[PDB]
């Protein structure tokens, strides 16, 4: 719970350099296993734009459109392709609660006041509270953007889930 407020205020204070918008999430047994959620090191997100590459590169053109050409020496470009690939990810905050709970009764056990339209009392065995950012380039925002959720365990392996921006804001953007 406690990470959502902090990330809200952080994206508020960092809004003029990048116009990211907060995206407070919860993950549960439908996503990753409890053995995976007990050793989950950190998360990773990336605001890939609507039509093209990503946010962490030049808008028009780069030196990564070229073929790899199957060489041994600079197999994929060299180190600069590694730097471009490392720069485009941003680290979101992270908080995992590895005990079974109910979300609404948890938030009422904290100070918040959930007023849901009908009792969708969701139950889960472990709740990891994550909070991504999604970009608006101008103050408007296209629905054709997508996200890339990257979950990292300390062995080096990862998993990737992707979803668009349209389904995220299908009703809540239409509620404002």
């Amino acid at each position: 719970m406690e990470t959502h407020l902090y990330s809200d205020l952080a994206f508020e204070a960092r809004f003029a350099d990048d116009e990211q918008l907060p995206l407070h999430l919860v993950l549960d047994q439908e996503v990753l296993s409890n053995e995976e959620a007990e050793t989950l090191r950190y998360v990773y997100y990336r605001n890939v734009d609507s039509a093209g590459r990503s946010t962490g590169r030049a808008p028009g053109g780069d030196e990564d459109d070229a073929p790899a050409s199957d060489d041994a020496e600079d197999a994929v470009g060299g180190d600069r392709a590694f730097d471009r690939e490392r720069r485009t990810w941003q680290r979101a905050c992270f908080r995992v609660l590895p005990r079974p709970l109910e979300l609404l009764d948890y938030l009422r056990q904290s100070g918040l006041t959930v007023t849901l339209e009908k009792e969708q009392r969701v139950r889960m065995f472990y709740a990891v509270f994550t909070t991504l950012g999604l970009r608006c380039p101008d103050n408007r925002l296209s629905g054709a953007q997508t996200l890339h959720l990257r979950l990292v365990w300390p062995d080096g392996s990862y998993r990737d889930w992707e979803f668009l921006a349209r389904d995220l804001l299908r009703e809540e953007m239409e509620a404002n």
Partner: protein, 296 residues
């Protein structure tokens, strides 16, 4: 341990009568040497025009204090006090003492009855209660901060208000740190250091709460970040849009920031802390000497 302090000069018996009034006073010595001359006695080994105050308080941290015990005609028995046992010292400084007060030691800038020789003089540090010591310490430090802008007159009224000091039977004139529209050099480094520490405290926590809340993030970090947002919003309210801090910083500039923050924090310990020396016990009548425990 005993120290024998002799004089190479001729000692007049009138000056013996002056010196026996200093039957037991605090004097500092730069190094615990058994037989010593009188040129290392007192604070006359550090007096000049240019150093001033903070140099003496820095050099008083590493000096060892001692008490005069008896007077021979050409040597003085100095007696280094030890912790826990108690001794009778004399109230040298202008403030009078009360029972229970923790006594601290300070260089006598205002001082103005001393041993007099041809080139050597005797000067003894003020034995002041600790709250007055911290009080005049922060008074002198704020008076050093105001030293650049005294061309205006309400700030002249401010430093005139800061000039006097309220205590029991006490109206002292703390001397002006800025002389001839210029500051003495160690106070200049001190005020500059606390100024730049106050600057980097603003300019680095905005990065480091982000760097630290990727761990377990309690509500301490959340209210800290909101307080930082309040500072940023009240800072740049009369300014253009935002300072707009970046995320991808060069490493070595951050190292040069943080090491500078700590190394200039290092040279402010003499001003933020106080060596307590004596905890006083039952005082003599009219408060000119007192039995005190040496808490060193």
């Amino acid at each position: 341990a005993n120290i024998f302090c002799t004089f190479d000069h001729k000692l007049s018996i009138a000056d013996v009568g002056k010196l026996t009034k200093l039957v037991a006073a605090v004097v500092p010595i730069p190094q615990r040497l058994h037989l010593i001359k009188h040129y290392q006695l007192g604070l006359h080994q550090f007096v000049d025009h240019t150093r001033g105050y903070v140099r003496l308080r820095g050099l008083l941290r590493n000096m060892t204090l001692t008490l005069m015990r008896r007077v021979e005609g050409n040597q003085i028995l100095l007696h280094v006090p030890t912790h826990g046992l108690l001794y009778t010292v004399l109230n040298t400084g202008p403030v009078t003492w009360e029972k229970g007060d923790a006594l601290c030691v300070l260089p006598p800038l205002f001082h103005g009855n001393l041993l007099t020789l041809g080139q050597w003089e005797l000067v003894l540090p003020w034995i002041v209660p600790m709250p007055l010591a911290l009080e005049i310490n922060q008074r002198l430090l704020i008076m050093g901060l105001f030293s650049l802008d005294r061309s205006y007159e309400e700030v002249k009224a401010a430093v005139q208000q800061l000039q006097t000091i309220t205590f029991r039977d006490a109206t002292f004139t703390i001397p002006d740190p800025v002389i001839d529209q210029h500051l003495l050099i160690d106070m200049k480094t001190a005020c500059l250091s606390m100024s730049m520490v106050a600057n980097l405290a603003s300019e680095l926590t905005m990065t480091y709460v982000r760097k630290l809340a990727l761990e377990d993030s309690s509500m301490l970090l959340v209210k800290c970040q909101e307080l930082l947002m309040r500072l940023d919003r009240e800072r740049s309210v009369g300014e253009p849009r935002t300072p707009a801090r970046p995320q991808h910083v060069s490493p070595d500039d951050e190292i040069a920031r943080l090491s500078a923050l700590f190394v200039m924090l290092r040279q402010l310990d003499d001003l933020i802390r106080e060596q307590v020396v004596f905890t006083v016990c039952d005082v003599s009548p009219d408060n000119k000497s007192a039995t005190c425990i040496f808490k060193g």
